[PDB]
């Protein structure tokens, strides 16, 4: 995350770390939606151009974490993955349309002060909170700044608040063909505040707290942060609700 700050313990109990079994390596962020299911980005699992095609066996998730590298005994939980489901329409060749994937946990994970699920959104939640200007929150252990110039890897989880941005404005900020399945967020050029998600924050959650019920909802999945080395105007996120149906089709049907 660029231009964010140290997360408070338990500020985002649904934050998950997608971890490569060997070489042990942090791959992406992810979110806990129930004690058996985790959401992350499809490109965090599959990307043919770089030889990436992970199976449930090569990966692992770490839950309830704060420190990026320490073993948080008695606090974090490690879980194996039973299966990985990448949206069958995931577009990696061109624009990441449908950049989402579902991971079923080998066993249910216990909730605690540090492990608690985030709500998915419904029609009402979308149309009332997903609007230009409204700020959402992104969390991650991605890099602190572009590479090659301090220290770039955080030692603890990071948070940053970002404002959604008008679609037409998102579309005109890139040659990439944007779709209804995604949305962008971030401050403007002349804007005083920067703050963005970087590459290692991919797959993580974009969440908004309802003013109604006080419940947090995950509106998007970091699909293409615009920070650090990537630099583009705004960051792009997979539109969770827009994919809510595929999420049931997968769940109701496989676990």
């Amino acid at each position: 995350i660029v231009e964010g700050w140290d997360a408070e313990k338990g500020i985002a109990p649904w934050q998950v770390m997608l971890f490569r079994k060997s070489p042990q390596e942090l791959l992406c962020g992810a979110s806990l939606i129930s004690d058996r299911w985790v959401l992350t980005a499809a490109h965090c699992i599959l990307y043919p151009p770089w030889d990436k095609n992970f199976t449930e066996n090569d990966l692992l998730v770490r839950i309830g974490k704060h420190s990026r590298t320490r073993y948080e005994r008695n606090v974090e939980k490690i879980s194996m993955l039973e299966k990985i489901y990448v949206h069958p329409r995931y577009n990696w060749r061109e624009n990441l349309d449908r950049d989402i994937a579902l991971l079923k946990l080998k066993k249910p994970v216990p909730f605690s002060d540090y492990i608690h699920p985030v709500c998915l959104p419904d029609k009402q939640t979308v149309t009332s909170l997903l609007r230009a200007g409204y700020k959402g929150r992104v969390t991650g252990w991605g890099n602190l700044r572009e590479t090659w110039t301090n220290e770039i890897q955080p030692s603890v989880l990071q948070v940053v608040n970002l404002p959604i941005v008008e679609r037409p404005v998102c579309k005109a900020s890139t040659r990439i063909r944007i779709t209804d399945n995604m949305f962008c967020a971030g401050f403007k050029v002349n804007d005083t505040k920067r703050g963005d998600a970087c590459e290692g924050d991919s797959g993580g959650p974009f969440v908004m707290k309802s003013p109604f019920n006080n419940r947090w909802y995950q509106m998007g999945i970091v699909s293409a942060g615009a920070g650090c080395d990537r630099k583009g105007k705004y960051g792009f996120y997979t539109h969770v609700f827009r994919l809510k149906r595929w999420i049931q089709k997968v769940i109701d049907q496989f676990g």
């Binding site: 042990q24 390596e25 942090l26 770490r62 590298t69 320490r70 073993y71 005994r73 008695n74 974090e76 490690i78």
Partner: peptide, 15 residues
């Protein structure tokens, strides 16, 4: 060991 492990080992307290 240790500086050879970018991440502290995390299997204790397991299964």
């Amino acid at each position: 060991r240790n500086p050879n492990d970018k991440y502290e080992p995390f299997w204790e307290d397991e299964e």
